[PDB]
């Protein structure tokens, strides 16, 4: 779970951080 | 920390939203942004026309917890969208690396 920890946290910025910007 | 770990911490983290959104709803003033779960953290408060400014959460494992989340809060009460899409502004590039 080291990279399946950080993974998981890519889809929850990628829809999270919302300024394109 | 492992995955499932760290989603704990998440469904924990949103239950704790819902009681402070639960709770300004019994006590209610003026027209301020209300309380807000983005599914990362739980939005406070925010004063109308000003950035609202949140510590990165400390149970998120790869957050830099010494950085701000930062979101719009217009004079109207509601949270600002991002201009030409339809989803609230949150600029999360100080908890993160890749951004
Ligand atoms: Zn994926």
Redesign the interface.
Known sequence: ?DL???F???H??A??????? | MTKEEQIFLLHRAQAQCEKRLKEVLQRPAGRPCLPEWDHILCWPLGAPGEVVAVPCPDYIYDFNHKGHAYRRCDRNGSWELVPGHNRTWANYSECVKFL
């Open positions: 779970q399946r920890r950080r998981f946290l890519h929850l910025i829809e999270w951080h919302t300024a394109e910007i």
